[PDB]
Amino acid sequence: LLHAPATVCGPKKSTNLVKNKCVNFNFNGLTGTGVLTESNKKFLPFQQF
């Protein structure tokens, strides 16, 4: 537990996408509760949130 901050990634247990209901989402770091609707806003290739 020294030298560089090494990341060992982790397990990848992904589930199906939720269309329209209040669910608990874990979007690879973001935790909360809400409805995951479709979007019209356009992101950038380096922007994640």
Binding site: A4, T7, L44, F46
Partner: peptide, 25 residues
Amino acid sequence: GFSALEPLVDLPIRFQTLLAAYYVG
């Protein structure tokens, strides 16, 4: 002119150059 600099690559871990008219900031 104004131009924002997008991230290229983040690499997890005396200045010289080779081939001019280059600047250094």
